[PDB]
Amino acid sequence: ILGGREAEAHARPYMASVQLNGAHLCGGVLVAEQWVLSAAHCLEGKVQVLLGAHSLSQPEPSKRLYDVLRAVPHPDSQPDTIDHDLLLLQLSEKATLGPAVRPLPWQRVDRDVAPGTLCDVAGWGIVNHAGRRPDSLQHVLLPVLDRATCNTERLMCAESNRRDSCKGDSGGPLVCGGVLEGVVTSGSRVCGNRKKPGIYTRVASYAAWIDSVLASA
Ligand SMILES: CC(=O)c1cccc(CC(=O)N2CCC[C@H]2C(=O)Nc2cccc(Br)n2)c1
Numbered sequence: 744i745l746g747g748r749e750a751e752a753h754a755r756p757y758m759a760s761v762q763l764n765g766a767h768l769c770g771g772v773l774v775a776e777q778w779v780l781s782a783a784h785c786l787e788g789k790v791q792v793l794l795g796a797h798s799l800s801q802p803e804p805s806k807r808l809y810d811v812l813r814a815v816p817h818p819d820s821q822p823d824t825i826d827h828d829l830l831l832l833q834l835s836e837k838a839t840l841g842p843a844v845r846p847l848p849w850q851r852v853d854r855d856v857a858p859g860t861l862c863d864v865a866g867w868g869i870v871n872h873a874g875r876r877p878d879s880l881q882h883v884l885l886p887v888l889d890r891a892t893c894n895t896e897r898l899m900c901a902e903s904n905r906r907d908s909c910k911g912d913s914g915g916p917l918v919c920g921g922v923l924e925g926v927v928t929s930g931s932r933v934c935g936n937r938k939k940p941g942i943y944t945r946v947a948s949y950a951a952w953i954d955s956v957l958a959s960a
Pocket residue numbers: 767768769784785786867868869876908909910911912913927928929930931932933934
């Protein structure tokens with residue numbers, strides 16, 4: 744997160760760190776007891792998911808790491824494209840739920856969020872252009888852009904004027920009126936430059952796919 748603030752410990756109880764050989768790689772969103780949604784290129788052998796966390800290193804009563812049982816990228820995702828950039832991860836067991844670990848409802852109705860609406864993006868991605876990795880969760884509020892300024896029906900844009908998502912925030916949520924609307928893209932892009940808006944996959948565009956994966960296993 745660039746130009747943001749430190750999040751309040753555990754106030755975003757859906758927030759997941761998606762980790763690869765022990766280190767944070769991507770954000771994620773607890774959407775059911777045993778399913779975290781992230782982005783497709785968050786994949787590249789040993790994948791895990793930390794729930795209930797504010798600090799990645801420090802001891803917290805709610806922190807729980809989990810093994811991943813199944814990794815389901817969207818079938819139409821490609822390693823070199825930003826389309827269909829979703830990934831579902833089934834956890835090893837169902838998450839121990841509490842005030843600090845709670846699934847986030849996702850938008851099932853396929854209407855765009857109103858342009859100008861500020862939505863909340865949280866993550867452990869880089870906080871500057873030198874690559875600094877924060878210990879504790881960060882967030883920033885970002886105004887949503889109309890479709891034509893964005894320029895897919897399946898993607899949505901947010902302003903990137905200093906305040907922005909960046910490397911390592913990929914796969915984490917964009918939240919608007921307490922509902923998940925967006926998942927941060929996992930393709931490379933310049934951050935912090937108002938002329939290159941943030942890109943987030945509209946989850947409502949993929950209600951059929953998600954369900955069809957959350958039916959099973
Ligand atoms: C969303 C966006 O603005 C943006 C910009 C540039 C780059 C990216 C891509 C991105 O992040 N990834 C690609 C898949 C792995 C993940 C990553 O590289 N994870 C990571 C690496 C080092 C430190 C940290 Br913390 N995380 C997104």
